[PDB]
Ligand binder design. Structure first.
Ligand SMILES: [Cl-]
Ligand SMILES: [Mg+2]
Ligand SMILES: [Mg+2]
Ligand SMILES: [Mg+2]
Ligand SMILES: [Mg+2]
Lengths: 233, 222, 250, 191, 204, 212, 195, 222, 195
């Protein structure tokens, strides 16, 4: 039995016609304090998978090590480690999902919510969620924490069902993601302006974007707001 | 519940969904969450349903009496003040979360009231279990200098976000538009995107199916 | 300190008269003439606006008052007593009825509540009776149109048509000749203006005459649309212009 | 603080300077980790030139501020314009006597012509403390220096505290009159 | 120790074509123990019908209360109360006890004597009105009734058909509830005649 | 839940109800509450469904291993004690069980053992377990005799469950009957309580409080 | 206070009430009469919380006796039972409620019918052919349901009652020291001294 | 404190015919008032003409299904590719469930298939392994809404033969696969209306001697 | 499990144990023998937590019977009581203690003396002229303090025991369905069938 200390907030993601997008801010909070601002919560595994993790940061760093050690172990006595017998997102997911459920069944969970985003060897998109309880689910859009309440509704306007995926481009998907991240900055008290974003395309591969910022915000209307009701000045 | 309020050029608009829950059970599939306080002051309410109706009717009653006493049309700030002071007095035990809006001789207004007695001012507001889904939409699409038709669209889109994505919200979209110099127009069931599909079978029973022990005529007359 | 008048100021005299009620009725007699006429499709109530000074704005002083959307009132006697009665009548329509049944009270019951308030001033400690007689016109679904008089004693009577105040004796005689059970609302308004001209001495126009009706529903005066069952108030106060139009064809 | 109720955070300040006094604050209001209002006005007027900064319970601070405004309006009708000290006393009297049921931290700031700029802070307990400033400051700063002092101070609070954020609102109280100032994130963040 | 589920019972109301129906089970128990098989939960005040589920003492108390209030309404108004008006009276009376409520789930049913319109309504224990075109459910087997009513019900049923629909909704709901059953009664209400039938159901 | 089992001249009668509840919700009306341990032994289910099913099935496996090794039918005493010793090992862990282990052997005759999850093991002539046990005991106690016929004994067990099914909210559905003889048990059918009640009311004249 | 039973037969109502009064580990009394005569043809038995039981019963008794004097008239059992229910209904929402369960056995002289009312501490009234309070119903209702007939005589009712007491004495954990039996009929109230 | 359990909502339904059997379930996955997925299957083909669903806490449901599937695999290895009968699978699942008696799988399990005589079979389990064969069984969140309807329409409970004075019951009979699917669809659309956790989609798995067939139907998304 | 008594007289030990076995609101059995013969001249009665009582008693019985076979010799009551105490003394600090109270009545053949030992679940042993467990001593100890003499006969002891049972039947709240009485003397153990 634990209690989380330094935490990471929402991780949002969505599928588009050729791949997947995933994003998460660069913050490690401490109850209410915005302590660590250089935290990368997106971790690439190979050149076809990205694991986005929210929740306890120390447990996240443990999972980083597991994935890193997984890549090493897969290359052992494997001449096709950079080809046919390379790690797939579905392998990486099932490993973590096994670990997460084992840990909760031992009453010593990894206090996280994880989203594995990637592209399979046959070009299929992979996007699946797993959390501290070992609960798994997949959807065209996935989000953790606040993202589940504020981002998913926005992303589902773009991809409301499976048939909308081929109609959605990377330019549109990226725009929805970046918009969602701005909305979370407005309304999540545990969020930051800085964030990271990753795109795994079946043609162009893995594009990893760091040091992004929320921009084109609306704050001007605040000057007209005065008091809480009757106050005119 | 999902309720919103949006300010526009010459007025204000509020909207709401129509689902009423009782735990995980839907008690009412088409309930009215838009309340009339005065003719041109309307209130959208979320939280404890009996409390939102009781508090909006009480203040509406006292507003009507005040309007007659003063020979003036009621103001939104009057409703706002009377509501928050009542809610504050009961320290949140009256679970009424409200969005108050209207037009008066002073102009067009939009406020929110929480059960504990706090009020907020804004150009766009949302309350209820679907307030995050709705606010996501409002923060994405809202802008300054909206038109009546743009505001109704934004409002009903924000409510839809709650209907689809929030389990506590559902069914239809109600709207009320309060414009300056005009009568307020209450649009009951402005949108009905959740119509029940035709059933595969009719479960109308053959007469005599039900077993009966006794029969008798009831006397309702004097 | 404190209100030590916990005893009745109105009491029975040896002859059986309740002096203060009789004297209150005397004050009503001195008051300006007001009248009410009931038609088949409406009710009309009217009175003269006795201006205290020509510098005074007689529009600000309203002798005819809305009590509910479907009920209106006028008086003869002491204006200040009337004003507070209207305030109490409006409030009691909400507290003792609308907040319970979710709908406005029928004419007879609101009248009953007003009568109760006036009866209490006749018997309670340390107060005098109200020095006014009210004429309350109204409509409700199950009783239709109705017109009631309410006296300082708290007694109320339903009328087809009547008058109270200064020239009520002559006015009632005039109404007896003209009234029938087939009168339309416009005919009742016409008779009301004829009856009132007899008692009025000075100027006789829309600025010196106050007149309201209980008639058809007024959707334009409701202030909102969208609820089919809510069709608007039956009470409507006639404007200064609307009165002058009917005075030409008099 | 009642569970689920609206919290006003605690990033507020008032600083006295040469020409008068300046009140400053953020605009964030929370319900847990959710930002209920990001453009809140925590600077409230109780009298022409007596304002306050609200912290803690939004409901409690609003109810109090409303009552104080009532008392100072009635005071003014009878006894003429009140002092900033008088305003702070009424706040305290409410916050102290109802300390069991309230969660209100208030900073009162005002401008007299005799007393000039004054600042009184009223913490949770219901105690009053007159100070030169409240939340490396020098006495008799200029308007421009005091603005930069409040701007830089609140900017950092927002940077490290999640209960704080949005815009920085400021109200300037001087013999000239009353001036409202506002500073957006793009400006103060990159300080 | 949940007042709404000590005594048990159910009530359901349905609309039809120029008719309404209201039905109830007859059980009264003390948790597992069945005490009475004659405890009727439907009452009428003139032509307005009221069904009440919940804590039996409050059911009895509220009936006596609305009898009291409707009897005085009639003396003063010189006419019998209508369903729409009575519905507001029930809501008023319940919210009057907002912080010490009666543990009940009332249901109003009747036809307006003036307009001829069928009317049904349901309330929560603090008087939130649930007006409905189709049907209203109340009791310990409300979930069950919601499932039966939502599938079986269809609009504009005739009195003789509506009887079978509401009877089958009640019976099959009550049989999946341990605290409901032990008898049943159905009121079929037309504009100027009312029939009351006792149903035969399993007694376990 | 209502389960009874009694000894008499002609062996043992076992009678149970069929209802299962999760709170107020009636999950099933078709539950088998008599566990057929083997052709000669029966066990009743009360308390935990899984606990009674699992361990009384397991008991049947132990009874089969005994007769394979010893070449002799296991006694009711020994069979019951294997179960009671097992649940005593688990005492404190939270097992929930209240059962009657019933059998008819040469050396013992008809025998019933009440076995219980806190380790109790009682031999007796009449046992009733469940939420409706008190109602069933009343009918049993007043009508029980050793010299009952098999026909009359079966009816007494059926009627006793009906008494419980009527009054106890958590008992009902249907009645399952069994007659245990020295040569094994005989099933005497499933009887819907709904139909059975009306039938008994008419023929017996009982339940005048109920209108039919 | 534990066992109170009631059986309405053709021409009378029979109330049976346990004699034991237990406090802690000691039975303090074994001859306690848990009943009060409200009027010549109305009898109320009671059981529940110590002190409350007798205080309530005597309060009701006084009120019914006051009514009898004022009107020179005996209130019907139905009227008495409604009055009693209302008092318990008031009580349950009081600061400290009467925790008392009662049976009201009476003979209505106008109808010429016996009547038995069961009222619990919540104010839950029911008219019954036979009734009980506490765990008493759990061992007797099945016996009463089976053997009870509506046209029974007083003597048949007493034999039916003996059957219930025997079953309680056999299966009830606590020793309730037998019962006092009282009969209410057209001639009034009398006690069966040998039971 | 860490709560190892959760409620992922959803509801399932298993009906048995004469020569077939169906196992249906909605495709909505939820936590609290949020929707996780609109299409997340929870009815599975486990081999040997056995279909299975473990509804409740999804993590436990997925683990149980995964273990049973693996149990089928090893049954073949150890017993010369013998076919696992539905009754043998039921008993095996009891042991899987009861093996965690003191830290249960929070799921209501149902399996469907054909018995050894070729007739339709449905088995339902409680969280700790008590099981029973049935003609009809609903499980999950809206089981209380669906089940009394099935009793009325599948097993014809409370329905008496017209004119017989409620003396002659309506006779039991096997339904066709077409009639069963109608009842399933109408069961789920009714549950979708009154239960907030039920909706989005409906997936039905039909089992005949020929194999396992699937059918999908949309449901309301509010 | 409730009432167990023991009286040591001149030439024998008499154990009396209640017959009732109650669970919840029902007396499941009224003929229960709450005792086991440990050896031909040693008898142990027991009372306490359900299941533990019989499990413990039979475990002791087996161990004493094993000793008897191994040594072809009967252990003295004192030796048996010490063995029993040690087992309860081990038990109280276990993961789940035996909640069982016992009386050990025996006749020592070497000393030609009857002996009564009282041992509670904690492993608290005492040799006594008369003993009881639970609340049973609260009503009988004053009677035995008064009426008991050390030179009594078996017949006088049985009359003294009858006096205790009568007092318990009068003042104890619970119906314990009488007692089974057993006598331990030089000739071994026998049961009094009519009591
Ligand atoms: Cl605020
Ligand atoms: Mg910040
Ligand atoms: Mg039932
Ligand atoms: Mg039952
Ligand atoms: Mg739904």
């Amino acid at each position: 039995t634990q209690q989380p200390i330094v935490t990471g907030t929402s991780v949002i993601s969505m599928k588009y016609d050729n791949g997947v997008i995933i994003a998460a801010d660069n913050l490690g909070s401490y109850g209410s304090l915005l302590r660590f601002n250089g935290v990368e919560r997106l971790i690439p595994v190979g050149d076809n998978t990205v694991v986005g993790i929210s929740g306890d940061i120390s447990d996240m760093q443990h999972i980083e090590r597991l994935l890193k050690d997984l890549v090493t172990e897969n290359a052992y006595d494997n001449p096709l480690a950079d080809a046919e017998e390379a790690l797939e997102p579905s392998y990486i997911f099932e490993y973590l999902a096994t670990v997460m459920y084992q840990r909760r069944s031992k009453m010593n969970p990894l206090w996280n919510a994880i989203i594995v985003a990637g592209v399979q060897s046959n070009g299929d998109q992979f996007l699946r969620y797993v959390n501290l309880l070992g609960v798994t689910y997949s959807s065209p859009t996935l989000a953790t924490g606040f993202g589940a309440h504020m981002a998913n509704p926005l992303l589902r306007k773009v991809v409301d069902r499976e048939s909308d995926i081929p109609k959605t481009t990377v330019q549109v998907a990226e725009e929805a993601i970046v918009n969602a991240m701005r909305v979370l900055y407005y309304r999540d008290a545990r969020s930051s302006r800085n964030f990271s974003l990753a795109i795994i395309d079946k043609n162009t591969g893995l594009t990893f974007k760091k040091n992004l910022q929320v921009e084109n915000m609306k704050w001007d209307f605040a000057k007209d707001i005065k008091g809480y009701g009757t106050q005119k000045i | 519940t999902t309720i919103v309020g949006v300010k526009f050029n010459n007025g204000v608009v509020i909207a709401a969904d129509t689902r009423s829950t009782q735990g995980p059970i839907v008690a009412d599939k088409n309930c009215a969450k838009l309340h009339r306080i005065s003719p041109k002051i309307w209130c959208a309410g979320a939280g404890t349903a009996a409390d939102t109706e009781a508090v909006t009717q009480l203040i509406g009653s006292n507003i009507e009496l005040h309007s007659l006493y003063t020979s003036r049309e009621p103001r939104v700030v009057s409703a706002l003040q009377m509501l928050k002071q009542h809610l504050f007095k009961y320290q949140g035990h009256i679970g009424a979360y409200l969005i108050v809006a209207g037009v008066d001789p002073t102009g067009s207004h939009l406020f929110s009231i929480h059960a504990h007695g706090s009020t907020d001012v804004g150009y766009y507001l949302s309350l209820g279990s679907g307030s995050l889904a709705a606010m996501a939409v409002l923060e994405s699409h809202w802008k300054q200098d909206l038109t009546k038709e743009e505001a109704i669209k934004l409002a009903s889109d924000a409510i839809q976000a709650g209907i689809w994505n929030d389990l506590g919200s559902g069914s239809n979209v109600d709207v009320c538009v309060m414009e300056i110099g005009k009568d307020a127009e209450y649009l009951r069931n402005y949108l009905t995107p959740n119509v029940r599909e035709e059933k595969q079978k009719s479960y109308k029973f053959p007469r005599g199916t039900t077993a009966v022990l006794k029969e008798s005529i009831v006397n309702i007359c004097d | 300190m404190t209100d030590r008048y916990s005893f009745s100021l109105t009491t029975f005299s040896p002859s059986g008269k309740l002096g203060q009620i009789d004297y209150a009725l005397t004050a009503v007699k001195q008051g300006v003439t007001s009248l009410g006429i009931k038609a088949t499709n409406g009710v009309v109530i009217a009175t003269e606006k006795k201006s205290s000074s020509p510098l005074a704005m007689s529009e600000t002083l309203s002798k005819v008052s809305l009590l509910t959307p479907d009920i209106g009132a006028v008086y003869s006697g002491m204006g200040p007593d009337y004003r507070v009665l209207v305030d109490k009548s409006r409030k009691v329509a909400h507290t003792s009825y609308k907040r319970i049944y979710g709908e406005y009270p029928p004419t007879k019951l609101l009248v009953s509540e007003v009568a109760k308030i006036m009866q209490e001033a006749t018997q309670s400690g340390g107060v005098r009776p109200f020095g006014v007689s009210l004429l309350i016109a109204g409509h409700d679904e199950f009783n239709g149109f109705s017109l009631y008089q309410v006296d300082p004693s708290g007694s109320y009577f339903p009328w087809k048509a009547t008058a109270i105040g200064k020239g009520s004796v002559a006015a009632k005689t005039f109404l007896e000749k003209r009234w029938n059970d087939e009168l339309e609302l416009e005919d009742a308004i016409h008779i009301a203006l004829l009856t009132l001209k007899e008692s009025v001495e000075g100027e006789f126009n829309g600025d010196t005459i106050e007149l309201a009706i209980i008639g058809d529903e007024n959707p334009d005066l409701l202030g909102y649309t969208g609820i089919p069952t809510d069709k608007g108030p039956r009470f409507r106060k006639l404007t200064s212009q609307e009165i002058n139009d009917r005075l030409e064809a008099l | 603080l009642k569970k689920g109720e609206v919290s006003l955070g605690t990033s507020i300040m008032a600083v006295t300077f040469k020409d008068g006094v300046i009140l400053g604050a953020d605009s964030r209001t929370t319900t847990g980790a959710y930002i209920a209002n990001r453009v809140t006005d925590k600077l409230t007027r109780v009298h022409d030139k007596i304002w306050c900064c609200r912290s803690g319970s939004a409901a409690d601070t609003q109810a109090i501020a409303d009552i104080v405004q009532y008392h100072l309006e009635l005071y003014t009708s009878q006894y003429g314009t009140p002092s900033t000290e008088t305003a702070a006393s009424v706040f305290k009297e409410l916050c102290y006597e109802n300390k069991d049921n309230l969660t209100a931290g208030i900073i009162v700031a005002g401008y007299d012509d005799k007393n000039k700029g004054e600042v009184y802070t009223i913490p949770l307990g219901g105690s009053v403390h007159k100070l030169p400033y409240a939340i490396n400051f020098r006495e008799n700063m200029s308007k421009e220096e005091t603005v930069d002092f409040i701007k830089h101070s609140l900017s950092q609070a927002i940077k490290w505290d999640g209960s704080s954020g949005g815009v920085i609102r400021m109200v300037v109280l001087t013999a000239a009159g009353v001036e409202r100032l506002i500073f957006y994130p793009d400006e103060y963040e990159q300080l | 120790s949940d007042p709404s589920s000590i005594n048990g019972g159910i009530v359901v109301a349905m609309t039809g074509k120029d008719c309404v129906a209201i039905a109830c089970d007859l059980r009264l128990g003390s948790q597992s123990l069945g005490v009475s098989n004659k405890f009727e939960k439907i009452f009428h005040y003139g032509h307005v019908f009221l069904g009440i589920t919940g804590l039996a003492t409050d059911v009895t108390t509220l009936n006596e209360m609305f009898r009291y209030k409707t009897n005085l309404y009639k003396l003063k108004e010189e006419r019998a109360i209508e369903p729409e008006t009575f519905t507001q009276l029930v809501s008023s009376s319940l919210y009057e006890r907002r912080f010490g409520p009666y543990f009940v789930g009332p249901v109003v049913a009747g036809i307006n004597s003036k307009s001829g319109k069928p009317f049904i309504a349901g309330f929560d224990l603090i008087g939130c009105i649930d007006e409905a075109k189709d049907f209203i459910v109340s009791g310990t087997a409300s979930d069950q009734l919601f499932g039966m009513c939502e599938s079986l019900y269809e609009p504009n049923l005739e009195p003789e058909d509506l009887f079978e629909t509401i009877s089958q909704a009640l019976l099959n709901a009550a049989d999946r509830d341990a605290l409901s059953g032990w008898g049943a009664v159905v009121y079929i209400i037309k504009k100027d005649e009312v029939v009351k039938r006792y149903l035969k159901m399993r007694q376990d | 839940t209502t389960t009874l089992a009694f000894r008499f001249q002609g062996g043992i009668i076992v009678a149970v109800d069929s209802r299962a509840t999760a709170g107020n919700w009636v999950a099933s009306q078709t539950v088998k509450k008599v566990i057929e341990i083997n052709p000669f032994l029966l066990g009743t289910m009360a308390g935990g469904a899984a606990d009674c099913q699992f361990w009384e099935t397991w008991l049947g496996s132990q009874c089969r291993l005994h007769e394979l090794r010893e070449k002799e039918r296991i006694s009711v005493a020994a069979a019951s004690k294997i179960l009671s010793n097992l649940v005593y090992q688990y005492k404190g862990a939270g097992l929930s069980m209240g059962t009657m282990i019933c059998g008819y052997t040469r050396k013992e005759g008809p025998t019933i053992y009440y076995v219980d999850s806190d380790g109790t093991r009682l031999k007796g002539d009449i046992f009733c377990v469940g939420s409706g046990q008190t109602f069933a005991y009343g009918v049993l106690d007043s009508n029980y005799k050793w010299d009952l016929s098999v026909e009359d004994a079966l009816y007494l067990g059926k009627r006793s469950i009906l008494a419980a099914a009527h009054r106890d909210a958590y008992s009902g559905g249907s009645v399952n009957l069994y007659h245990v003889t020295e040569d094994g048990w005989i099933y005497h059918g499933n009887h819907d309580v709904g139909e059975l009640f009306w039938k008994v009311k008419e023929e017996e004249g009982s339940f005048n409080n109920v209108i039919g | 206070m534990d066992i109170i039973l009631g059986i309405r037969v053709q021409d009378s109502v029979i109330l049976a009430s346990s004699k034991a009064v237990t406090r802690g580990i000691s039975v303090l009394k074994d001859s306690d009469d848990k009943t009060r005569q409200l009027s010549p043809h109305t009898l109320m038995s009671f059981a529940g919380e110590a002190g409350d039981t007798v205080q309530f019963a005597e309060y009701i008794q006084a009120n019914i006796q006051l009514y009898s004097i004022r009107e020179d008239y005996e209130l019907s059992p139905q009227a008495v039972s409604s009055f009693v229910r209302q008092e318990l209904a008031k009580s349950i929402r009081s600061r400290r409620p009467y925790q008392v369960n009662v049976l009201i056995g009476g003979y209505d002289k106008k109808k010429n019918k016996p009547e038995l009312y069961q009222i619990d501490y919540l104010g839950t009234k029911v008219e019954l052919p036979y009734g009980a309070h506490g765990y008493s119903g759990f061992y007797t209702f099945s016996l009463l349901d089976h053997h009870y007939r509506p046209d029974m005589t007083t003597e048949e009712g007493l034999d039916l009652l003996k059957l219930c007491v025997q079953e309680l004495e056999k299966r009830m954990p606590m020793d309730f020291k037998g019962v006092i039996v009282k009969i209410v009929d057209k001639d009034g109230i009398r006690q069966v001294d040998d039971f | 404190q860490f709560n190892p359990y959760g409620d992922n909502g959803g509801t399932i339904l298993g009906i048995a015919g004469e020569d077939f059997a169906v196992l249906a379930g909605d495709t909505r996955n939820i936590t609290d008032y949020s929707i996780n997925s609109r299409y997340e299957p929870k009815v599975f083909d486990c081999g040997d003409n056995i279909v299975m669903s473990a509804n409740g806490f999804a993590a436990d449901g997925d683990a149980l299904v995964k273990r049973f599937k693996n149990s089928v695999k090893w049954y073949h290895f150890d017993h010369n590719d013998k076919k696992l009968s539905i009754n043998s699978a039921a008993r095996n699942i009891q042991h899987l469930l009861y093996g965690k008696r003191f830290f249960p799988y929070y799921v209501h399990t149902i399996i469907a298939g054909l018995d050894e005589d070729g007739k339709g079979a449905v088995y339902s389990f409680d969280p700790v392994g008590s099981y029973e064969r049935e003609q009809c069984r609903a499980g999950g969140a809206a089981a209380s809404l669906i089940m009394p309807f099935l009793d009325n329409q599948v097993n014809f409970k409370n329905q008496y033969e017209p004119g017989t004075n409620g003396k002659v019951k309506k006779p039991l009979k096997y339904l066709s696969v077409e009639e069963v699917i109608k009842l399933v669809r109408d069961s789920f659309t009714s549950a979708t209306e009154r239960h907030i956790q039920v909706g989005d989609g409906l997936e039905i798995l039909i089992v005949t001697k020929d194999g396992v067939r699937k059918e999908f139907y949309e449901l309301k998304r509010d």
